[PDB]
Enzyme design. Sequence first.
Site, short mmCIF file in Angstrom:
data_model
loop_
_atom_site.label_atom_id
_atom_site.label_comp_id
_atom_site.label_asym_id
_atom_site.label_seq_id
_atom_site.Cartn_x
_atom_site.Cartn_y
_atom_site.Cartn_z
N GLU A 113 -9.44 -13.18 -2.23
CA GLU A 113 -8.61 -13.63 -1.12
C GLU A 113 -9.27 -14.85 -0.48
O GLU A 113 -10.46 -14.82 -0.17
CB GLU A 113 -8.46 -12.51 -0.06
N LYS A 163 -14.52 -8.44 0.03
CA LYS A 163 -14.58 -8.92 1.39
C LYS A 163 -16.01 -8.68 1.87
O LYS A 163 -16.57 -7.63 1.58
CB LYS A 163 -13.61 -8.17 2.29
N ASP A 204 2.34 1.95 3.39
CA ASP A 204 3.35 1.00 3.90
C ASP A 204 4.76 1.42 3.54
O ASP A 204 5.72 1.14 4.29
CB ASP A 204 3.17 -0.38 3.33
N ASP A 239 -1.28 -12.68 1.32
CA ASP A 239 -1.79 -11.65 2.19
C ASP A 239 -2.11 -12.27 3.53
O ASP A 239 -3.20 -12.82 3.71
CB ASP A 239 -3.01 -10.93 1.62
N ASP A 293 -11.48 -11.78 10.03
CA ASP A 293 -10.48 -12.10 9.02
C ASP A 293 -9.19 -12.48 9.70
O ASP A 293 -8.51 -11.64 10.30
CB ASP A 293 -10.30 -10.83 8.19
N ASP A 316 -4.94 -13.41 -3.61
CA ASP A 316 -4.38 -13.36 -2.27
C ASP A 316 -4.56 -14.71 -1.62
O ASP A 316 -5.69 -15.20 -1.46
CB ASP A 316 -5.06 -12.32 -1.39
N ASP A 375 -6.34 -14.17 8.33
CA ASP A 375 -5.10 -13.98 7.56
C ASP A 375 -4.01 -14.95 8.03
O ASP A 375 -2.82 -14.59 8.16
CB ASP A 375 -4.63 -12.54 7.59
N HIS A 380 -11.37 -14.22 2.64
CA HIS A 380 -12.53 -13.35 2.49
C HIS A 380 -13.75 -14.10 2.00
O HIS A 380 -14.86 -13.97 2.52
CB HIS A 380 -12.19 -12.16 1.62
N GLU A 439 -10.75 -6.35 -4.90
CA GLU A 439 -10.62 -7.40 -3.88
C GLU A 439 -11.88 -7.40 -3.04
O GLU A 439 -12.08 -6.49 -2.20
CB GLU A 439 -9.41 -7.14 -3.03
N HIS A 454 0.88 -1.18 0.00
CA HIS A 454 0.00 0.00 0.00
C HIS A 454 0.89 1.21 0.00
O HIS A 454 1.96 1.20 0.65
CB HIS A 454 -0.89 0.09 1.28
N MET A 479 2.53 -5.80 -8.06
CA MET A 479 1.22 -5.26 -7.65
C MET A 479 1.46 -4.19 -6.61
O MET A 479 2.36 -4.29 -5.78
CB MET A 479 0.32 -6.40 -7.18
CA LIG Z 1 -7.87 -10.90 4.90
MG LIG Z 2 -6.11 -9.21 0.86
#
Ligand SMILES: [Ca+2]
Ligand SMILES: [Mg+2]
Lengths: 387, 386, 387, 386
Positions: D216, D182, D56, D286, D254, D244, D256, D219, D180, D53, D87
């Site tokens: 993802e 979710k 980041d 991710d 979530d 992802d 992850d 998600h 993406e 991002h 990406m």
């Molecule tokens: Ca996630």
């Molecule tokens: Mg993701």
Amino acid sequence: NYQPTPEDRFTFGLWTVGWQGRDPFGDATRRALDPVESVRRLAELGAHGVTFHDDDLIPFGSSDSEREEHVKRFRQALDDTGMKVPMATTNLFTHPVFKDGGFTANDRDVRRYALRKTIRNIDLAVELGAETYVAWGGREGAESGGAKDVRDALDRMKEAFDLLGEYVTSQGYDIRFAIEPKPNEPRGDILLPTVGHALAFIERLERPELYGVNPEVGHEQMAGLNFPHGIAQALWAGKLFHIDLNGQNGIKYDQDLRFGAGDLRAAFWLVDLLESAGYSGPRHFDFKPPRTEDFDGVWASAAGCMRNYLILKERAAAFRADPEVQEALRASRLDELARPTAADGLQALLDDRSAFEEFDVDAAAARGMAFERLDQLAMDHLLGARG
Amino acid sequence: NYQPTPEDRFTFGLWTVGWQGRDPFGDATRRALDPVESVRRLAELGAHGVTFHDDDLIPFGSSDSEREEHVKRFRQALDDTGMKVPMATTNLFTHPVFKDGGFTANDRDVRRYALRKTIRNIDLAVELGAETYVAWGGREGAESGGAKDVRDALDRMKEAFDLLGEYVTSQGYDIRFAIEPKPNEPRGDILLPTVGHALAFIERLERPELYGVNPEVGHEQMAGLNFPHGIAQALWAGKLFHIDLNGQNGIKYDQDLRFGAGDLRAAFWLVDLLESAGYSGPRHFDFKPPRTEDFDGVWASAAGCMRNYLILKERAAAFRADPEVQEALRASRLDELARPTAADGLQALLDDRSAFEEFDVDAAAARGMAFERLDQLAMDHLLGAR
Amino acid sequence: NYQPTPEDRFTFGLWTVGWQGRDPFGDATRRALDPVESVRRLAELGAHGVTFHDDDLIPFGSSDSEREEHVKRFRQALDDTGMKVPMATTNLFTHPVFKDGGFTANDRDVRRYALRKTIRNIDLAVELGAETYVAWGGREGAESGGAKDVRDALDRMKEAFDLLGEYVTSQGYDIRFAIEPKPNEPRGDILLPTVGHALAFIERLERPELYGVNPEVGHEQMAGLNFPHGIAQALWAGKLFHIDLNGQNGIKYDQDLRFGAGDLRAAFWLVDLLESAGYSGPRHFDFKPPRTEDFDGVWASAAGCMRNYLILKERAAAFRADPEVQEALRASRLDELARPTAADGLQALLDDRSAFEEFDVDAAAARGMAFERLDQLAMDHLLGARG
Amino acid sequence: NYQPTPEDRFTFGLWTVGWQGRDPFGDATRRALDPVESVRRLAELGAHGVTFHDDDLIPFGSSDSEREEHVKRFRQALDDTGMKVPMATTNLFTHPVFKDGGFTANDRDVRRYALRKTIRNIDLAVELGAETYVAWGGREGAESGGAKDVRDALDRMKEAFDLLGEYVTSQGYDIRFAIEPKPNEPRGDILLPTVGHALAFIERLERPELYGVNPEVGHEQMAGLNFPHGIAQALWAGKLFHIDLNGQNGIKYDQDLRFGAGDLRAAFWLVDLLESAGYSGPRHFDFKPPRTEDFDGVWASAAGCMRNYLILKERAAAFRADPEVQEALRASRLDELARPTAADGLQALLDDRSAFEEFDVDAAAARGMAFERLDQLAMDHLLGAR
Ligand SMILES: [Ca+2]
Ligand SMILES: [Mg+2]
Ligand SMILES: [Ca+2]
Ligand SMILES: [Ca+2]
Ligand SMILES: [Ca+2]
Ligand SMILES: [Mg+2]
Ligand SMILES: [Mg+2]
Ligand SMILES: [Mg+2]
Ligand SMILES: [Mg+2]
Ligand SMILES: [Mg+2]
Ligand code: NA
Ligand code: NA
Ligand code: NA
Ligand code: NA
């Protein structure tokens, strides 16, 4: 107009209205609130009292002189307003040291610290008049299967709660404990994930009479369970020592919406049950004003918690008072459900041909339960759409 | 390899392999199986025994003579093969009379009948050698909030289980009861919806020692719960009398897939726990071969249940026996979890400055748990990728 | 008193009120209903019309003379009452031949049969005046990962729907198709599991204008989705050709409770949206009177579907008409949401310092959304607890 | 073995290994990582590249000079190692200004800012060589029904994505967008909640060819959906631009988790599909190393993502290459699924009595699908128990 007053026993955690709005994907949206301000604002809204985690009231790591100042100010606000403190609890989840738990951390030194932190705040809770001391073991659990031997963790959990019981007994305190279940979040799975698991665990403690549950609406709903049913089991066991009221939309992260939001019909049936059973404890809200809101929205959301309880109370009372409902309940045999099955005793039941060879199963099966008509009376009452 | 043998204690309900395939939306896809054929075929597959609901073995409404013949044939097949019957149960859910429940029906006459139907089958179960009598209250509950006063229903439920306990005690039977939770389906919400709720309820019975749980993999997963965790709590309580093994993909209708299907890693951790704890009861499968399958697929699916248990048993044993895993468990302080927190006692804890005043929280917080390395060793073992 | 009349456009499937009560663990609790009886009883309740699967109206395997008698009787009841038939559909799920699907069965001969069965009933639906022909592919999917190549299954699915489109076009019929999503049950996972998946698939059909969705309240809720939001996306796409109204309590088996039961607030917001958007299609109930009920309870449950829609319609209308709500909507900037972001165009946006270097992010962030006050007005309106 | 190499195309977000461990209920447990250290360590682990991002890589509010230095250092580490940046994406969720959304904020000034913030980072992404620009609208949605008119929000969402398409076209960039989905979290319900909803929305954009999905694993599983099925639909649509990879245990927040954790059999079937279909994009993780872990556990967890992909790739390949599996696929008529239903055409179908009048439904219904044997071969391959 559904205005709360202190005898309605509505209470709020400092961390509710005081939630700054940090979530997993976002920074705070509101400034910190001074506990003094919250006490005064909640009092003006018609609240009965407040509750706190240790670290809500006294910043973690405070010196003894800093601690006494925070407590002094808080006590003066309580004094000034007549607000009560019926419950308090420990924060055994925020600080990184608790990343694997408090009472069931794999590291023994952490488990001992967790107990000391809890005991210190029990003393304060007692001074302030609390009747209940809540424990939410939010960090007790695991993300992976090998990380936590659950039998050993339950041994540690029992050890911890037994020590707390030994402590309160040694000091002559009348405070009781209330374990608050949650199925997951922040751990992948949390130990004692539901009302049932907590009730069962309590029966293995050395002094089970000192412990009950603090169920939270949204937490049981995170497992897709029926909150009113779980409350009924807690009441049946004599263990509904306290309750957390809020809203939740099904199976997802813990939303902590204002009470009445989320599953509205479940809120209706909950209020009906609490009032019908004569629950006398605090009507405590553990909720978060959404981070979209500014402080005016904080107080509006808090006020809505109480308002929705009061509206639902009125509708449930009207439902139960309506002669048409009373007759629908008879049509559905709710009265027969209250009758013992076999007060005549086992041998009489075994000898009763009416219960077996001569029981007309088809005729019994043909008898409709009339539950839809009853439920639509309930709907009509909730919506103010009678007769 | 992974070939089952009777000593593995694998058992199956008659209703499992015998499921004809009717679902909410579909007619049967297979013919009914004769219980005698199921006993013989499961024996040939290496099963230890079978279980039944009353009405699986003796059609509802059978005359006394009919009943005797059904039971005689069944016992001949058992005696010929040496198959056991470790568990039985009552069907308190299929007949329309049970539409609002058996033990907690609003109609009192239905509740009495439910008890009589159960007691008749307890007697049979005992004659066949069953050690456990299961109760799945699938019709106890509600679709609407006013229909069922849950406190009164729990009074009725307690009264029923207490009468059953009185009965078995009066007859000198050694059989024990196992309550099988489920959270919903066919009722909108079912009473005693999880292992926890059932364990709690048992403690209010007059003779709690006579009752335990029969948890089912898929049922706890229908509430999104961790099945190994719930089994650990049941073992901790001394109440894992029996278990139902199957598969489920999360929160949806009760799938009853073959064991190993659904949540495979949960199956691994379940087997690891059962074996580690020395569970000695039946490894019972409550599963349905999917209605897509013909009879050859029925028997394949049943064989798969046992195969998957055996593969997972091997992999869990290899995990625990690996010195590298033992190292990792130490690194993650699983051994410290087994030590008492405060065997020194309350006063010593209170006086211990290392537990509070002089506890370096930051140093403790900095210590990684090493759980991901441990879990990847577990993954590698499960997958045979060491 | 919330009495339905035909212009309210309430419709019911024959299989709804006619559900005999067989479930996964239980036998039927009610006798079969004659479709003629259902038409007449629903008419007396104030229904607008009925719908059917082929096999609800004409028993599977009927001869041509048996078929014509069943259709004749049904038509006479429709004639007598003025009841309409706005929609019909095919049963591609009950018979064992469909155990692996209809249009996406692995066996090619089954796929061809499924198409022929569907086409036969399209002709009948058209004769009876249907505007929409629903397809619920309840058997399309799998319990295991290797059983179904989903890309090939979608190729087959597209082939089937394209043929149906070619068929209706060849006959000059104005009927349109509506695909009904469901995420699971009876298959472990069903293809096209949500409104979104169905909407996306339609865009790959040869004549996409002939196809829309028939979303069902409970089905989207089986995936924990927000039904009003999904309806809004369908409306936004111009694809809400029909709807199935019922109730569901979260993530579990398909309950098909009466409309208004289950998630009551979601029912409120749904009605608000349908009425605000001017949805003009049938208000169709796909529900099951619980098997606890006798026929009096069947009709009570059906009546409750319509009643709850009407109560919710009144409350949503009152909410939107209330000047206090209109001001709360302005306070929450719902009006700004309706304004284009950048009608000034891309280059103007890129050149606008107010949108970047000179945008005071802190001042913007400080502005509360006022969503809680708005939502509590909505609650107060739903519960008839204003002002 | 299972050692990754750059040709495996494994990529990681800076925010993954760099997650400091703050959750709803807990403070950070790890220090921030310098992006340069992450690039170098991931290179050493065998990664192909990294993603980010905006915020980041360049702290929010950085001056132009600060920004240049952050980017320069990062590019030096990329150039030294040969790591790619396939990406990038925008943070439209952390700053309080985005509390009601970016592109669909009720406040118009916020929507304009969100677009400007995105466009600035598209330019950077292009300079670094990114082929895909992801958009996760995590703040687009609502907690209450009146707060968000979803039709108007979708108008705003379309307007935003159309402006972004106009922008990239105007600059002659080759970058494509991947939405993406979710379903919820952090909003009570998020707009475009699943792969399906995103795919549908794309078809209403002015230049649909410029947009795809970035699904993802976790998600779709937060809605209880079958992730391999949704990926198959995305591939069928020609829209799987990026993915992802991670793990999730069912319907909850979530998680992850590292790839391979969570639903292991879904991971197997996902890898089987990606490899079978020839997906050629990044295998992007991710994920979040659990906050229990120290940095050594961070890097172990990241290595585990890649290891698990490689093990599953091996097992899926062995499954497909097994002649016994090929036999079973034929027995289950997977090959008949690939044949057109009616290449003979509509009229021929209508005239075909074998398709209706003379179709023996009972004979067809009696044919078992043999899916359980097939699935047990798949299980045996996954577990290395052939
Ligand atoms: Ca996630
Ligand atoms: Mg993701
Ligand atoms: Ca909560
Ligand atoms: Ca089951
Ligand atoms: Ca349905
Ligand atoms: Mg709480
Ligand atoms: Mg009472
Ligand atoms: Mg079972
Ligand atoms: Mg429907
Ligand atoms: Mg508008
Ligand atoms: Na939230
Ligand atoms: Na029987
Ligand atoms: Na039901
Ligand atoms: Na930045």
